[PDB]
Amino acid sequence: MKEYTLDKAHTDVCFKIKHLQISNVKGNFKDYSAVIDFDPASAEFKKLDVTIKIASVNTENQTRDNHLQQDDFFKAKKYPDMTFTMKKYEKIDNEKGKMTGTLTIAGVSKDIVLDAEIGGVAKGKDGKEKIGFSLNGKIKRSDFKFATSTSTITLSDDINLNIEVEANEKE
Amino acid sequence: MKEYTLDKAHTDVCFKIKHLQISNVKGNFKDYSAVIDFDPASAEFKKLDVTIKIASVNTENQTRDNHLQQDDFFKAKKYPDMTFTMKKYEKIDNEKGKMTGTLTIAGVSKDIVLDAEIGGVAKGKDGKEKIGFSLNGKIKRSDFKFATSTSTITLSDDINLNIEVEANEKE
Amino acid sequence: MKEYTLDKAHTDVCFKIKHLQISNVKGNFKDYSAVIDFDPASAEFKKLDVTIKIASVNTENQTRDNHLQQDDFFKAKKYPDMTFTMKKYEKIDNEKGKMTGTLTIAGVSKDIVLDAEIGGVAKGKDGKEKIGFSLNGKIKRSDFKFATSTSTITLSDDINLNIEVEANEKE
Amino acid sequence: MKEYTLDKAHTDVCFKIKHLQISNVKGNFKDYSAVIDFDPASAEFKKLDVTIKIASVNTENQTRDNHLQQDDFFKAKKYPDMTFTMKKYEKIDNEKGKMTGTLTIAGVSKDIVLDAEIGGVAKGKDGKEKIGFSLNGKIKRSDFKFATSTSTITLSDDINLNIEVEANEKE
Ligand SMILES: O=C(O)c1cc(S)ccc1[N+](=O)[O-]
Ligand SMILES: O=C(O)c1cc(S)ccc1[N+](=O)[O-]
Ligand SMILES: O=C(O)c1cc(S)ccc1[N+](=O)[O-]
Ligand SMILES: O=C(O)c1cc(S)ccc1[N+](=O)[O-]
C-alpha cells in the first residue's frame, strides 16, 4: 500500500436526511363582492351575500395561485366564483353572533356556521355609518369534495376562514 | 336594517390551511480525521479509519446544529465523536468497490457497506501521490437506535452518506 | 454457462414501499364526575364542573392508555385529573348555547368554548327530571403545552371533544 | 335552576385526535417469467431477463391491487408488463455480485443495480442442477416518473425490491 492524509479543503463528510415540515398556507382574494344588511340598533345581520372570484386568489406565490385554478383544485374555468349566502344570524350579544349560511365551492354547497365578532359599530366623522366586524370558522375540504385528489395528509382537511370587514353605509 | 358597501382597502377574505412539505437536511462536519491506506497498483483500500467530532456538525443553521448535540440526538457531551473503521474492501474493478466497516454513533456500533467510487488516482505535478474518491451508502437511524424519540415519520429512518475525499501522500 | 427455469412455487418477485395513513384516535374516560345545574324553564346551564380521572382513559388499546399517562403526555402521577369549570353560558335558543369554561390539563389552564346542544329536557315517567345534552368543541394541544415532545405532524394539534350526557335530578 | 347527577351508563367523555402511522406495503406478483443463464463454475450470471405481468400484483388486498392498475399508478391497459434486462454482472465473490440492468415500468426505462446474493448452487438429488439466489435493491419512483400524482410524502419515493429465486436446469 501507500498512506494518504486528507486534504480537508476538498473533502466533505456529508449527509442527507429527509424530514417533513408542517406549515400554514395563508391567502386572501383580490376580487370579491358583498351585500351587507345590518341593523346597528339591534346589532343583527339581516342579509350577507358574498361572491368571490376564484381567479383573484393570492397566496403570495404566483406558481401556486395558478395551480389552484386547475381541475385538482378550484376548476376556475368551469366554476369561476365561490359564494356565501347568509341564511340565519343568531345573535349572542352585541359583540358576538352565530351566522349560518350556504357556502358553494366548485358548484358544491354546504351550510356552514361562522362566528361573527363585531369589531365595532360607529357613525363616522363625515356623519355616515361605518361598521367593523369579522367572520371566523373552520370548513372541511371533504365536505365540499374539494381537491379530492390531494390526500388529507399532504394538505389539511381543515380550512380556516377569517373574513375581516370594514364597511360603510350606501348611496 | 341599513345597507353597507365593503371598503375593499381594509377587508380580507382570508384563509389558512395546514400542509406538509418533505425536504432534505444536508450537513457536513467541519472537524474529523482519517487514516487512509490505499495501494494504487491494485486500487484497493487497506485501512480506512475515520473519526468525526460531532461538535463540528454543520447543517447551515446554527440553532439546529446545537439541538443535534442534545440527548434526543447525538449526546455530544457523553459521546463526542462518531467513528468509522474499515473491516474489508471488496474490489469491483479499478473504479468501484464494496467497503464494509464499523460505524459507531453515540456508542452504538453497526457494520455498514459503503460504495467506493474512485474519483481518480494520480501522481501530482510536485511528484507526490494524490487520490480522489467517494464513499456512498444509506444507514438506518433505527439500526443505531438514533434519535429514537423522533418518529420515523417526522425525520426519515434513512440517512444517506456521501464522503467526498481528495488525499495526498504522507511525510 | 447453463440455463435455469424458475420454480414459481419458491420464487417471490417482491417489493416494500413505505406509506403514511392518517387515522382518528377515539377515546373516552371510564371515571369522571360532574356537578350539573340547569334551569329547564329557561334552558340555561348555571354551573357545570367536570373532573376527569386521567387514569381511566380508554382508547380501546391498553398499551397506548398506559403510555398516555407518561411524562410525554398526561403525567398522571403528578397531575391525576383533568378538569372543566363553566364560567359562562351564553344561550342561543332552547336547543343551542355557547358554554365558556376553564379547562385544565396537566396543571395548565385555558378558557375554551363548547357548543351546547340540548338533546332534550324531560320529566321522566317516574315523575323526576331528566335531561339529555351534548358539549362539542376543538382544543389545541399547543394551547395547553400538551405532549409537547410529540410533533404536530405525527399527532394533530387539534383535539375534538364530544361530551354526551344523560342526567337525572338530585336527592 | 335544578341539579342533576350524571347517568354514567349513557354519558361519554369523549375525544378524537388525528394521527399518522407509517407502514410498509409488501406485495409480490403471481405471474412473471424469466430467462436465467448462470455458470456455476465461476458463479456469474450471464443473462437475466424478467417480465412481470402488472395484472398479477398482490399486495394482499384486492381493492388496492385493482387501484394499482389505474392511470395514477401502473396503467396496466397501456403498459401491461414491467421488465428487467441484465446488462452486466460484476462478481464480488462466489456469494455476492453487483448486477446492473434495465428496469422498465410503464414504458419508462432506467438502469438499476441489484445486489445478487447467491443462496446456494447445487446438483439436486435427481442429478440435475438447481440454484437458490436473491436480488436486492432500492429504486426511486421519481426515477421512473411513477405514480407522479401521489406525493413523495403519502407514499415513499423509495421502493425496495427483493427477488427470491429457486431455479432448476433446462430441458
Ligand atoms: O447530493 C449529494 O451529492 C449528497 C451530498 C451530501 S452532503 C450527502 C449525501 C449526498 N448524496 O446522498 O448523494
Ligand atoms: O391568523 C389569522 O388571523 C388568520 C388569517 C387569515 S388570512 C385566515 C384565517 C386566520 N385565522 O384562522 O385566524
Ligand atoms: O422483508 C423482506 O425480506 C422483503 C420482502 C419483499 S416482498 C420485498 C423486499 C424486502 N426487503 O427489502 O427486504
Ligand atoms: O364522532 C363522534 O361523534 C365523536 C366521538 C368522540 S368520543 C369524540 C368526538 C366526536 N366528534 O368530534 O364528533
Automatic annotation (TrEMBL), chains A, B, C, D:
InterPro entries: Lipid/polyisoprenoid-bd_YceI, TTHA0802/YceI-like_sf. It comes from the Bacteria. The keyword Signal applies. SUPFAM superfamilies: YceI-like (SSF101874). Residues 3-168 form the Lipid/polyisoprenoid-binding YceI-like domain. Keywords: Signal. This is Periplasmic protein.
